[PDB]
Symmetry: D2
Subunit: 480 residues, 4 copies
């Protein structure tokens, strides 16, 4: 048995009735419990994520099967059997909190590893490539996909205007308009790091790496009709499914594989291996098993832990570094930036975001300082041997720069269409039909000129691809 | 033709490429256009409304048919034919911003009238009563209805626990579990002030008043199966329908009626006329036509005008005052309190929220001061005849207090069940069948003891009502 | 020995050099440690307090000498010898952070008692009365006293305009313009509750109470010239003194006394005992010793503890209640209101603001949720016997209302001048000379009409008082 | 004559009395004017600037005497007689908002030019060099100079610990401990760009540039004793002096000069010309007159205009670019980053911060959106010719990078002592005595080892310098 109290710790005498002039009169200003309770209620909500606002979280463990020390000094990967706690958030992308999990969208697949050398965040999606290759375009792309700023409803005419004028999107659209554009839930779902990163070993040697997550449950997708039948009765079916699996002891898992590529392989490929519109061949750069992640614990509070969770691709650990990928480069900035706005300056002290490894530094103050700081010395260098100092065992690598000037210029070998064609041809006939069906339903209402440009882009990917789409849309492409 | 610019007004040379070390190298910090554009992107979102987060707005006009000056000095009601501009937001209640408009919920019906004596907000719902009668309970009620704080899914076991232990909710639930719990859209929908207010005329005479909005388009509702079939294909159908009517010149309208009641009728009744769980008889207090409101204009920008719209029941104008209704009393505080958090201290300068009437006062500063203030004199009294002064022609009435002490105590004559029984019996047989069906589907999974208490509450309302519900839930109540 | 780390817990390799294109080239965006460290620096500051921005804090203990249970059920006062931890902040009033502590101003004297029945804040000043008697005037008053909104310099012509048109200020000005307007430091200083409060005992009986703190160190004050000489060499002398006394073990202390007055004495006094422009005669309502407070510990971090400290007069504990004082009434609202803005919705979780008594309630979420919440049940009533419940042993009293109606009307018997005359006459001749001197230097540049009004107000207080001031300002008042 | 109103535009009946239960009873919650007026009061303050918090602003004009088009395409410099409007803020550095203007500190000298090609901010100080050369050290440097985080008082032991361990500070300390460390006011004061920037002409040719502002009123300083005498009677004397000069038509002015240096001179020098601890010889790189800035207009409101003013070194206009200076490089980021926090995401719409040049882009939303946005198209590329497009006439230059790797490494030729020794010798004997006096008073209480290191640093600058300082501090340095 417990008293209900104010936030001052005074037991509440009456949690039913306001204080008033007799039993039916107007209310008094001197009712501290009323005003405190209402004022906190009035302040419960914080801004949702700018994208990926709808999602669900879980905790688990990652266990190493094959140590990776030949290729990376990363501590969490250093020995067979090593277990590292994780927190994971899965999400849709474009619509707000509260929106259905049956809509077409990439899915987010964000993993926070609480390592002995700091937190490492791998901020992936299910699909392994992206629509764009430079972060300067990201607000433009998002604004085109988001609901129209007048009507508040998503408009294909708007995003297809953008995508068509951005032909590097063609590979990604070829994946997203398969039925994999609507994963059945979060458990039966692919994961991908998307970018190339750099792995750096104890000798200072560097390889390029890609990450892949393979579901123990298998990959399963929904047709447009299957999605509509679910949407009719449950607009949070994937959140529900994740929670329910874990509560029942049916823990979903993913095996982590990597591909590894010598830096020197740049020069003989017909694409840029750091162009995030590209995959790497699994025949030429085979998947290598690393370990397995199992999610086995639901959060205790959705707001405190899942809504407030903060991931960033710049949360890198020794042995794992960014590549030169221009899309990645902007993400390094945008995440902690948006998080300072969304969550406050001190968002890294929110429990789910805290490292297991020690934090010592000379930062101070900021809104909601709750950590009980002490000491006179908040600057370095200083004369005190016991105060925190830099440690040169933990320097990052020094990537070679091939460029001689500060430039704004597209990468060489963009190759916008080749891999889209390759993906198209890799589809079964049944898969090709679904792609054409899904594209047609999306394109049939859009501006004719934009519709034609879309057909043209897909035709450059593969002639059959583009001709089938033209036929299905009733567009005659003879004069071209 | 226009240049794309930074916020400094410098034309942008290249809106495609980040600044990098050659065409493929990493990105430079000295790229003001990238950082500015990303940072503003990262800050687009503000907190959504704590309740009624999903909604849609429109502008229009209210015209007086019958001047109301014998009963209220309100300027906007003073003459036949007098037109007043309005802004209106319609909404659901419980789920977040992107959530479907096919869910069961009251609907918000908020009207801002830009009058010559200031803005008047009538912050209504479609349904004419409420679940509770004291604002102290509102965070409890909402927390029970909202998604479970662990799972992020709404749970009937939670809100039926609260509602059953809050028997004053019994009238409201008898309306909400009719098919009127799911209006077809925002146009074919009732509106209500819910509370009794006080109207005060030029002689200082006061009557109690209730407001009702009657749709020109008629009232239409959805069965659970009809709601599911719409939900399958459109989670924003009511937002779409409002915009589309207005874009096509098919402007929806509502006629405004009032009921008026002498203060002295308090003793003539077996309920409190300021208990918001109660309606007033239309036989005994007939509806009197006031005028008509027609919505004819969509906003130019959804975020700036609809998302940032701020209404409050305390935005009263001369001749219209609060009643002693303890639920209303809390609302007077909570809206501008939540708005200061949600929108900023200076939220009343946001264009949609600005009055048409002049604003002059001694308030100053606050975040985002954009109004070009001037002058040395920001205090009153002051010796300067030209500075703003108080005006005694605009004093409020002085309501009589019947209570002799500051108390926390329920109103007398709560009468929690009588009007619920009356509403039940007023239903057609078809309507009664839908109510039972809708209650049953909601109750069938809840805790058995709570289930029984719900049945009991409805049985106290009407024996047939409660017995039918018990039969439909397979609960044997012989022996109570 | 410790590593400097990022907020991700990664050891920092180099805390001296930014990442750049060779040893002298421009900087890279991929420098997580630079960006994180700068971005947090950029966010260190929060808004200062709207008034009382300059101040200093200390911890200590209050011990009861005489139990107060005949008069109040307050727990912290129940027994001889009972010790309660306190936090205290002392302050100036008008100028910002960083301003000198040699300026004329009331001094704040704010005490938080961490009691077994919740936190009790007594938010006093050194002087025992105030300038105004209704909170509606507080922003006007402050704006007049604050630096001019154009020039950023305080202007006597502005605040004497307000004060002279607000004759209730006349008693307060009679104390503030003694040399007690400029206390020597925070230790050698009076403290006062200012307001009448209500004390309620175990039988439900109520008395009015005033609080007084008497320094162990005695009261000492600075002449205008003494203040200037300090200001020359130390603009933070009182913050320095408080810290230094404590660091050297010379702990300052105050004895707490009360006056007590029957409610019934209202009707036979020639002033309102809840008018905060009034004191109560110490002959007629003698000082009664309660206990002693000793300050013996400096805070560990000034920002986290003293800057973030939040006091409110509405932090009342059982046995201690507001009076009807209309100035007090506004404070109940304003403090927690400002604090939600200044410190965040969860400011009560900041360590210095936390109660020692347990906190349990159904509030949730809000910016910077750090407390690891859990559970499904965030609503009451609920079916769970273990969840927090109200406790009827802790109801507040029910003050009798003597008023008929909701009114906006000055109190009866304002008596603006009588006590100001009595205080004048109580001054030694030296003290009377200082008063006249300090008033004269402040008034001599003000608008002649405002100057004459000031003289009149003081002449109504006491003829000799007003005549002396007139003589000293060279103003001939014979014709009046 | 005007009505005082609420923010809803309702005339106020009574601005003196709260609404209460009779003339003396407690206060009612239904008092919208009280709550609104107090709640806005409670939200007036915003965070002060993290450094340079104490300052004053004025408007004026800059006029070109000698067109600069041979060296820069900057529009505002393109023709003789061309006038550009400016806003200017002057400041101190380390202490908070209300702190005295008589303290030792660099002074800020920030100029915002409202040009036809956008706003150009030149964010200078009075002194022409800085303490450090890499922005990574800036929060360290500030934390050491700021008041101790425990005591709230500045401590020379703390900043001298840092500066002595940061020998690059030696030149700057040599200027700051002359009596120029305390300018007499803001008018009689030097201005400096400090950094080398790049000027780029219409042919794409680049030179290094330094900026210098020469006061029409001359340079005048205060001794320590002169400063104390002013501080005794006025802690805002420079704020006062600037306002007063302008109000009486005694407009202060500064002539702008530049030095220009070929990029190819890097190897001809024994220091790095982009090391901000270094000046360039006026013999070798002569001062060239550009034009004159006159300040002739005080702001209308100090908060709206001066407190909310936002400058950034990254507000560069075509023809003027950053140099590789690593200190500059961090500032490009930190200013808009801190401003978004301090002022809100939309701080560029605050009037003083608005460009005169047109602003069009695809940014949207954010707190306090007051600009009435419209249109469907908030993304680029898009199919619409009339929407804003990039303009390739406004590309920035492409600086040559001399580095081949991403490194964290100090510049070559730091040369920490040489220019300090040159400055020392350039002082008159009277100036040398003041420098020694000021350094001695600052150093005499610091830790002995730190004291010795300071002496060593200054002795490396010049033997006489160091020996005089050692003699004056009583430190025997013969064994070294
Ligand atoms: C320029 C490109 C991109 C930008 C600018 C960007 C920016 C952002 C931002 C600002 C957020 C909100 C973060 C928060 O509020 O805590 C976010 C979330 C997210 N992004 Fe991205 N993103 C980009 C590309 C990508 C890519 C390529 C992926 C996958 C590789 C991805 C996966 C995600 C995920 C999964 C989340 C949600 C993380 C969570 O669960 O909280 N993003 N992104
Ligand atoms: C209508 C009257 C008043 C209003 C509206 C008002 C409002 C405020 C506000 C808003 C603050 C800032 C609080 C914070 O940020 O924590 C403050 C501080 C303070 N006020 Fe008042 N105040 C009033 C009268 C008084 C009175 C009568 C006293 C003493 C009797 C007083 C003593 C103080 C003190 C000591 C502080 C500083 C709190 C601290 O140390 O942190 N005030 N006041
Ligand atoms: Cl921010
Ligand atoms: Cl640090
Ligand atoms: Cl006002
Ligand atoms: Cl707030
Ligand atoms: Cl609660
Ligand atoms: Cl843009
Ligand atoms: Na191994
Ligand atoms: Na010329």
């Amino acid at each position: 048995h417990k008293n209900l109290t104010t936030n001052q710790g005074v037991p509440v005498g009456d949690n039913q009735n306001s204080r008033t002039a007799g039993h039916r009169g107007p209310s008094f200003l001197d009712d501290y419990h009323l005003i405190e309770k209402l004022a906190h209620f009035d302040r419960e909500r914080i801004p949702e994520r700018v994208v990926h606002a709808r999602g669900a979280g879980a905790y688990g463990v990652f266990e190493v099967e094959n140590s990776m020390e030949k290729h990376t000094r990363a501590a969490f990967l250093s020995e067979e059997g090593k277990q590292t706690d994780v927190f994971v958030r899965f999400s849709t992308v474009i619509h707000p909190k509260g929106s259905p999990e049956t809509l077409r969208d990439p899915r987010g697949f964000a993993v926070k590893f609480y390592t002995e050398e700091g937190n490492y965040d791998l901020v992936g999606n299910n699909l392994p490539i992206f629509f764009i290759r430079d972060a300067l375009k990201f607000p433009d792309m998002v604004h085109s996909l988001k609901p129209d700023p007048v009507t508040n409803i998503q408009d294909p005419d708007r995003y297809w205007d953008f995508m068509t004028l951005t032909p590097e999107s063609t590979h990604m659209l070829t994946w997203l308009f398969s039925d994999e554009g609507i994963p059945a839930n979060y458990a039966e779902m692919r994961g991908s790091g998307v970018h190339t990163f750099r792995w750096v070993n104890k000798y200072g040697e560097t390889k390029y790496v890609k990450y892949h997550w393979r579901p123990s449950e298998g990959i399963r997708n929904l047709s447009m009709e299957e999605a509509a039948e679910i949407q009719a009765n449950d607009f949070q079916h994937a959140t529900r499914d994740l929670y329910d699996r874990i509560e029942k002891g049916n823990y979903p898992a993913w095996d982590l594989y990597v591909q590894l590529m010598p830096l020197s392989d740049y020069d003989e490929l017909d694409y840029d291996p750091c162009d995030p519109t590209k995959t790497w061949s699994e025949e030429d750069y085979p998947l290598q098993k690393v370990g397995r992640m199992t999610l086995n614990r639901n959060p205790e509070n959705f707001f405190a832990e899942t809504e407030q969770a903060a991931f960033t691709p710049s949360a890198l650990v020794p042995g794992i570094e960014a590549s030169e990928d221009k899309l990645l480069q902007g993400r390094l900035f945008s995440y902690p930036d948006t998080q300072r706005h969304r969550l406050g300056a001190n968002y890294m002290r929110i429990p789910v975001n805290c490292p297991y490894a020690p934090v010592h530094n000379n930062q101070q103050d900021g809104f909601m300082t709750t950590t009980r700081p002490s000491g006179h010395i908040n600057y370095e260098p200083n004369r005190y041997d016991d105060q925190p100092k830099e440690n040169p065992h933990y320097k990052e690598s020094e990537p070679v720069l091939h460029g001689d000037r500060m430039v704004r210029q597209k990468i060489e070998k963009p190759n916008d269409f080749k891999q889209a064609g390759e993906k198209y041809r890799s589809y079964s006939e049944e898969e090709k039909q679904a792609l054409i069906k899904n594209l047609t339903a999306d394109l049939k209402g859009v501006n004719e000129k934009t519709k034609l440009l879309a057909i043209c882009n897909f035709y450059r990917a593969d002639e059959d691809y583009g001709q089938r789409l033209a036929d299905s849309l009733g567009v005659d492409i003879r004069s071209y």
